[PDB]
């Protein structure tokens, strides 16, 4: 069972709008909203959304596998070897947020300070001592962006696996000689950096010029979670405030996906007239180019919604009914909706490009969707005894049996996958976890979990104290 299986199972449930019944849904950790900083929902006047992996949650592992297959096919078409066609996506390998080291060709899981938690070269997991040869301080400088690329989006899951497949393939194929920074094929030398760049370019190509969008929209039932509670929640938001869409996607793709998401024989609730998806938004903006959107942005354009093309010129007119915007900036949204940053709850999955930047640059309130949480929670609670044991062992130090710490850390981590939990390795939190705590005011497996809280709800987190204050 994947995380999207959980989401789709919860999606198939009709709501019961009884206040006591919605409150009781928050028994299950799966339906909760989690709180890093306090947020009085009564002060939120605008709810903003990203589309991909937020409103449109792509089913796993099917969508990752499609991306993988198309990326492989593109690499083969530009001259990579035919053996790539025998690879098959394996959802049990990648965890999101890994760092590809382009110098040595390793995937690294790191903490918020760049300390190594896991190091794999292809499919070989390198133990601590062997790691010191390449990482003498078991540390990387993660802002050396020429060397390290952080794979922190769900769209990066197929390339996370593909990088490891490629390193493994070239290492074990006798045509190539393994060197410390790449592979030698006679008078050709393929550095891990060049290989990585080829992969990154191919993933981009598949999204922008290849068939990924076309294949997705041909079979939306296969590729996209659909939930009758989406229209209901968005309708309740629009009763208390304004609702907006700000997506990097183009209008044509957005319209196909959103039409599908709202394709039920009813509107917000069963028995109600169906309403077009656009009627749920006070403001619709596509081609947003986030993160640049949260600084200078690009010029504000208007979409000709009959053709899907942009009208010629910068749009200088007012917010009007039926208009669709393209480009612009986060200030556009504030100005057109008459909002200040703290009046906005922005709902998205991109912990950097959206959540971090909207928070740091604009002081927006933030809700982070983490699709994997649906499955990470099941593992966390199910294997709570292992972590409890780890926490007991860490305590038990009067000042060997640190290999029991390593064993239990290994067994815990393997329950999540080969690269472990998104949030930790044993007792050490990942960079991704630290970024979630720092920049996501609220988070959950789905934003639909807001359905289970009233709009006057006060989401509370404990006041933080420094060590000398404690």
């Amino acid at each position: 069972t994947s995380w999207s299986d959980r989401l789709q199972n919860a999606a198939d449930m009709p709501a019961n709008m009884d206040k006591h019944a919605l409150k009781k849904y928050r028994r299950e950790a799966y339906h909760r909203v989690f709180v890093n900083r306090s947020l009085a929902m009564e002060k939120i006047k605008c709810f903003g959304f990203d589309m991909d992996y937020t409103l449109a949650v792509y089913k796993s592992p099917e969508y990752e596998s499609l991306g993988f297959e198309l990326t492989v096919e593109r690499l083969v078409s530009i001259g990579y070897p035919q053996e790539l066609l025998s690879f098959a996506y394996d959802s049990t390998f990648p965890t999101r947020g890994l760092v590809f080291d382009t110098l040595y060709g390793n995937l690294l899981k790191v903490d918020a300070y760049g300390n190594l938690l896991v190091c794999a070269h292809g499919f070989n997991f390198i133990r601590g001592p062997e790691t010191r040869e390449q990482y003498p301080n078991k540390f990387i400088q993660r802002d050396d962006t020429e060397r390290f690329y952080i794979l922190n989006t769900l769209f990066n899951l197929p390339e996370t696996y593909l990088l490891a497949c490629l390193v493994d393939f070239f290492t074990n194929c006798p045509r190539y000689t393994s060197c410390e920074t790449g592979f030698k094929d006679g008078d050709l030398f393929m550095s891990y950096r060049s290989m990585f760049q080829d992969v990154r370019d191919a993933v981009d190509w598949v999204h922008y010029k290849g068939s990924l969008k076309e294949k997705t929209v041909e079979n939306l039932e296969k590729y996209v979670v659909k939930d009758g509670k989406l229209p209901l929640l968005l309708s309740w938001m629009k009763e208390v405030g304004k609702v907006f869409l700000a997506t990097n996607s183009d209008y044509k793709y957005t319209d196909k996906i959103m039409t599908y998401l709202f394709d039920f024989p009813h509107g917000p609730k069963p028995g109600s007239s169906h309403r077009p998806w656009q009627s749920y938004f006070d403001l619709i903006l596509v081609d947003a180019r986030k993160p640049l959107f949260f600084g200078e942005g690009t010029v504000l354009r208007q979409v000709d919604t009959k053709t899907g093309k942009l009208k010629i010129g910068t749009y200088t007119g007012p917010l009007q009914h039926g208009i669709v915007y393209s480009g612009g900036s986060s200030d556009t949204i504030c100005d057109l909706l008459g909002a200040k940053g703290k009046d906005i709850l922005y709902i998205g999955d991109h912990i950097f490009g959206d959540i971090l930047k909207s928070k740091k640059r604009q002081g927006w309130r933030t809700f982070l969707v983490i699709p994997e949480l649906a499955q990470e929670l099941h593992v966390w609670t199910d294997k709570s005894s292992l972590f409890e044991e780890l926490q007991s062992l860490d305590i038990f130090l009067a000042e060997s049996i640190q290999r029991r710490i390593k064993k239990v850390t290994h067994d815990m981590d393997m329950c999540y996958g080969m690269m472990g939990s998104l949030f930790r390795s044993g007792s050490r939190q990942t960079l991704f976890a630290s970024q979630v705590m720092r920049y996501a005011d609220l988070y959950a497996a789905s934003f639909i979990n807001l359905l289970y809280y009233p709009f006057s709800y006060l989401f509370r987190a404990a006041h933080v104290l420094m060590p000398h204050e404690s």
Copy 2:
């Protein structure tokens, strides 16, 4: 008769290799090589070439008209008005080297110091006094590259005309209101800058993603000058030194064009066996990315000439027979051919990207091909009396009748086209002329003119003296 008609007429002539006969060809100014700095041909050990508009001279106005049509069609496809489809390319308007002012939407012909010689807004030629409102010092800062774009390649001729067509169209169409920096269409404002960017992007699109290459290669006889003397000259070069190709074009396009250029029922001379185009080069490099090529370049790759794809990896091996390179840098060429810069004569049409940069960055010797010269010479000699008269009038000043200077300047210029000579307006030299004198050691309407000089020839220019030395 276009400049390419002249080139093709001279192309149809079989050579007579009699030394006296080849020397007598240099009667006609049309067959001469012109000299800005002295060059002892005996010291040249390597001859290097660009392909486009150098080896492969595209026929005019047919190729410009094709580019124009495809660019228009692309703009219409992205949402420009259908009326664009009624435009038709007019070769009598554009002269190469004009500056588009993106603030005010004017085409400007300027001297080497940025002084205005000609200013047109659409198809309205603005007289001197009216020019002062927008250009108070009749001057532009040409290195303000955010505002001014210099249209100095032959590929820029269609967009030169298209910019003027667009300014004219929007000015005279009652749907739009003319403003000083663009056009208002209700709540849309299209700046001249945005319009220019759309045009530039569309020209790029047509070359890289559209059908321009496909349409060219479907009818090479229509679009490309072919000359049996090309193989002959290149064969003579290879007897005295090394020959190389360094082109921005890709291998597949290069191979189609070059195959056509050498498709005769013979090799260098009639009666000789035909030889493949690649046999004429000691070194073949495609995807050169000039001008970057003359600094750091890009990594050296090898072309798989069976597939037209790049082999995977950086190429680390030696110069070998049959290899085709991709990317690299000008140092690659020097190293692989064992040459120093002054041993190289580099032959090309791009007065900036190639000739200027190879000279300034590497000290290569330079030969500039200027296709328009074939027709500019006919006008210069034919209307020599007008210039003579202008030169007499300038002299005749004891220290009105400056309007006779303006009249004669106008009539002279109109013989060349609406934007005048590539090289001057009346007695004032253009920026393009100044750049040719400064960076092209030799220049001519075609590099084939080298056929008429022996390889021991000493091309001589007079020693330059400062005014106080004279």
Copy 3:
């Protein structure tokens, strides 16, 4: 009683080296080391130091007042009005870590997310509603470094006060007209930005070209804390590992200050022979240019310790006894001492330039000295009932009397000074507090507090859990 009075009082105490007695010193919160992340002291092989406000703690408010006076005198000498000479430093105004807004001339205390906690224009504290006119979202973008300057060093305390004095003076002097971004004096307009730049330049001038160093070294007893336990602790460090100095100061100043710090009629303990300060260090590096030191650094030079001048050339030789280095980089230290980053405990006061950068760029362990903590602890414990009351009030919300929250927040804050605690305003933590927690592994009012812990000590912090893990 200032924070340096506390430090000097604790400095006058002779140590009792009895293990039970040193352990009992850590009763008092004042003598503790506080722990943000666990640190096994047994793994530290190198102890590194900054000098200023770390080894050499300047007495307060005397040193701030000297800096203030000299800065004022410099501004007057370059043409500011004579009335500046009537200002007198007031230690009750500035708190460290404030942000000067150069657009509107305000001092701001902000949280880690840029939310406004306190806003003063000159000496006028602006209440919440009035703050919205200039800060509509009660938020600033703190990385807009062209607009906002963060005053986070102890050397910035005099200019913090001077900025407020200047804004107040120009506002209330009838020669000038107050505008929203500065002051008008007829045909002169002095923006807050220009004024700020003048102040910043004058503070720099006083440190680098003026008399601050000379006046300090003429009366070290007045200006610098001296503690017989310093040599003792450094001697114990050198028994278990290596000790180094890396200071931005020059050799001549360093030697004067360090000579004073070790000028007792004994060495590490009473009865022992006095030893020169240099004998306490395995490596001495001056002119470090931190933070650049933690990236590329500058070339490694050697100090001629007889003249205080640099020897000519880059130093290419080995670590040798008696050598003093200048410039270099953090890698120099690692290489010369044979250390990896995690083997180093770097001890300093500069929460950005040293502690943050050594941690992020190199993975060094960090100990932050916070001189004000000595007094902030006395206030925190003494007025613990007020905070307790605030914490109770925050709890008491069933979901007015938020003005009791504002009242109690005000009274709590005023016990620290006019700009409140370095660490918080009421229940909200400051940016400075957040940076301390994030980047300082350990912190204390003085590094001398390490004297009270054995070198095998395991400093422990609780494992952090995400909200969904709790």
Copy 4:
């Protein structure tokens, strides 16, 4: 006899204002204005000046020798060896416009294309073949500004000589080992780059913080050319147009120098009342920070001329009598004087910082003062037979005795000095010559030569023709 001896000799001559007599002064090449582009003096409405080496011509070799001595003393004070004190400035070595190669420690004289004309390592002149080892193509990339520094100001003459002295000293002193990129002194390595940087910093120090200004103003008769015709010419300029000063120097230095330049017992002509120097200018601007002045500039300030300090604030008021400006931009001058660029003749010695930039960025007309011309003309005419012979030899080629070309080139060049003419080596023009021709509309040994032409004069240069036009 130095060039300043010539200038001072011509300075001692009283004018005879008889029109026939002033015209006859232009017999002598020494009193002419030379013309690169035509300039109708009748259209010039504003005359602008730099001060140093333009109005205030420093006497040679005395001023160079003072700069040299103070620069040496500064290097010794920061730790260079005492032997530097035995160096003595030698005016027969340096020619202006040489390039210091910081990689190999050579002084190079180059043409406009970076071709090597002369190469000296210390005082060893390297012949052609030996030059190829370090310069394989006898070429440098002169815009590699990290490697090459062009010594093109008269203030650079002392450091030109000092660089050669230092290279010579370290090469021949047995304490140091000569390496290809610097010198080894045990465990110290002094690169030519570091040495160059020390020299450059010391020259800057001497001008900005040392005693050069103080020593100059203590003995102005020794150090500065004074000419009673200066006030006369400036008075005639002010009758036909506006006059301005735009200098990088500060007000205090400017006032000392300018007071001296106008200290005669009369005003413009003998018998007239003396008038203060400021009365000769419609606009006085100091601290100009050229070349930045010709782009964005700095904020406009006003000088308090009683104190020599800046008034506080940006100056927002109008041009008024008696005001002195500081900073600003070239637009300030245009706006305040109501001028367009082509109405301005800007008179200066800095062929880059002023003449090039005012021309390229603003389209100002330009007059370049070249103090050395006064002596270069005497050599050019005196040894005209040698150049004539060189020109004959170059001609005499039917297509050995190229060593006669080298011999005659050597003997010609040696008449100017060890590094030859500022303008050429034999038949090859220098970079400096090419820049003069390209950017100086007019040039002369002194701007005082304008006294010999009426203000209606039409300065004429021949129309330039391309080779194909000839």
